[PDB]
Design a protein around this nucleic acid. Structure first.
Length: 254
DNA sequence: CCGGAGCGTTCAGCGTTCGTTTATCTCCCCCTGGCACTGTCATCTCCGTCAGACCGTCGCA
């Protein structure tokens, strides 16, 4: 609310496709139109040619004469957004005029870099506040209802980035002395995603000092059974090592 | 001692809305066409290979 300046046009990709024009919404339109606007939004303002956008929306088999289709999608964007916010060069399309804080993705990289800098500087309160602001950026599933295998690619990429971001958040929560909300979040995420080894290692680390041992190794045994049933291999050596040092109960990491 | 309301699932009515095309309206581009005092033949290479052919040429005998 403190960064809501006059004339600000805010764009959002981490949650669904929406536009905020000084507090009032804009109709982003068709799902393919939403995917087109998102594809322009991921490229931080390239002039990207018509064939590349056609491939981004659809992939291997776009209809043959659908170049005029993308043309009229561009017309839709130009009449629903500002005339000058979208400009065309040599047949390519480009959204400019994006200030700081206009895109939630740019704010996400900014907050991640600030958290990394604070971790390098050894600060904890400012980094915790930065990642608290960062976890409020995503709203539900990223890229809600957009077609295209391209959109699937940045969907899985942003999901993986969110996974490492929450891994770092939970890790600093564990090292600074937070366990209750930590184990709550880890249990919720392992309920959501059952086949991540790193989050279950985080479960072991969090429960190891919060006063919980039986269900931690029960969850580990369930992980071993599912990983043997679905993969039939052995887990990472760092895991077995973490369970090992746990077993002799070293109070060094208290 | 089967009834009932509530609950799960499964499909047809209509109502808007995306998916995909089309011609119309600015803007730029590109090829052809037009210049009506007179002004009517430029240009500077190329040398201190180099060696001995190999050749046809070509005027003299």
């Amino acid at each position: 609310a403190e960064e809501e300046e006059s004339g600000a046009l805010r764009f959002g990709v981490l949650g669904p496709v929406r536009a905020w024009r000084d507090g009032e919404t804009l109709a982003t339109g068709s799902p393919q139109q939403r995917a087109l606007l998102a594809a322009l939004l991921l490229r931080e303002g390239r002039t990207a040619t018509a064939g590349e956008l056609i491939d981004a929306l659809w992939g291997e088999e776009p209809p043959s004469q659908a170049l005029a289709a993308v043309r009229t999608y561009a017309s839709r964007l130009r009449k629903v957004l500002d005339p000058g916010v979208l400009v065309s060069e040599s047949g390519g399309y480009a959204v400019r005029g994006l200030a700081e804080g206009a895109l939630d993705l740019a704010r996400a990289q900014d907050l991640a870099s600030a958290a990394e800098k604070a971790r390098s500087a050894g600060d904890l309160c400012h980094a915790r506040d930065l990642l608290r602001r960062a976890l409020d950026l995503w709203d539900g599933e990223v890229l809600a209802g957009v077609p295209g295998p391209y959109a699937q690619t940045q969907r899985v990429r942003l999901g993986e980035w969110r996974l490492q971001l929450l891994e770092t958040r939970l890790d600093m929560d564990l090292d600074q002395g937070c366990h209750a909300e930590a184990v709550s979040e880890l249990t919720a995420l392992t309920a959501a995603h059952p086949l991540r080894e790193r989050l279950r290692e985080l479960l072991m680390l969090a429960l190891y000092r919060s006063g919980r041992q039986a269900e931690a190794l029960a969850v580990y045994a369930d992980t071993r059974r599912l990983l043997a049933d679905e993969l039939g291999v052995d887990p990472r050596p760092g895991l077995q090592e973490l369970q090992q040092r746990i077993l002799q109960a070293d109070p060094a990491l208290a």
